[PDB]
Amino acid sequence: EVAIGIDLGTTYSCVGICRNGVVDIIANDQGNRTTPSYVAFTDTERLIGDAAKNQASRNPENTVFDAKRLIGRKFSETTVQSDMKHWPFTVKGGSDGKPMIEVSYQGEKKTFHPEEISSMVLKKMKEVAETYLGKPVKNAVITVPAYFNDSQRQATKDAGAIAGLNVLRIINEPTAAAIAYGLDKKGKGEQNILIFDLGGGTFDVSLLTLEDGIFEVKATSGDTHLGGEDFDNKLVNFCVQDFKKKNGGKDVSKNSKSLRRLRTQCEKAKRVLSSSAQATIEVDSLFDGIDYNVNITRAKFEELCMDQFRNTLIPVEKVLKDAKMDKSQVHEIVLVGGSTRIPKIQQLIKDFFNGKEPCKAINPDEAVAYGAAVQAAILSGDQSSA
């Protein structure tokens, strides 16, 4: 009877519950309101979430992430050929054409389908909700990108069933974000909603229309390889070159462990730069026992990412063109995804929409789970959010 909403994200997942008209986003064991979509296998144990992401640089080969890029795809798809360059783990094609993720677990070679890896993330999110409620949870609404095809959606549903969840429904991520803000029950008249979703690995822009509680996805666009990880890479590339100028041409990029440790600190400094004017990137004994330290101003970060930030407007213009509508016709702009916390991105979107304030009251990396939790409560017969 208890139903949860789960945002099964590319890089982070989130679980919410809507009870008595109110939505609680549930913190995991480490107090984190989102959980990495990571699964790691060691000589002794299977780690999921924070523990898996935390040891990724020490166990790259057996730490799986990005299973959402493989779920419901045939291994031969060109997107798999292209994406696999970014994965330290091995992916091979099975006789059925499905991807098989290969890891070592307790000294043995193991293979998993993408939906098996995703089922472990879903099981962790289910357990996070169960620990909070103190009761077992069986029903869930799980979200997927609006462009996900039938195979990708069915494999996501199968991942839910493997995790022990009764999937009440698979719904679109942009629609879940709009439902979170009560835009389906506000005004009644026709509303054009733009969802601007910039996460860790992907960028999705969706233009929705809503007449009388009915959402329709009119147009979608974006870039499946533009996200926060790309802004971290701009900081990494700068630091690699800065280390060269400081230490007689020494190249950190030759050591993959040095790059991973540098990337971890680049991502931390980036987050700091969303609320501070400066941040320090520091890695003790980075390469050749040399300590690395640099100060990055928000202005320098904005400069390194200038083109990537500005180019987020290209898919915005594309959805408006496809839907045959002017930017002045957009009633609400909803910011979704952890990267929408970057002040420069918020300013670019606001200026594009002629000073219109975007809807960002809900923590952007929680809005999809928040909407899914609302839909899960409605599908369970609870009309309290209405």
Ligand SMILES: Nc1ncnc2c1ncn2[C@@H]1O[C@H](COP(=O)(O)OP(N)(=O)O)[C@@H](O)[C@H]1O
């Ligand atoms: N305060 C912040 N400033 C800039 N970026 C931030 C941030 N808080 C989170 N992020 C970024 O959000 C991205 C994760 O986005 P999120 O919406 O949680 O994940 P996902 N699975 O939908 O891709 C990461 O690249 C992370 O660095």
Ligand SMILES: [Cl-]
């Ligand atoms: Cl419920």
Ligand SMILES: [Cl-]
């Ligand atoms: Cl409780």
Ligand SMILES: [Cl-]
């Ligand atoms: Cl929809």
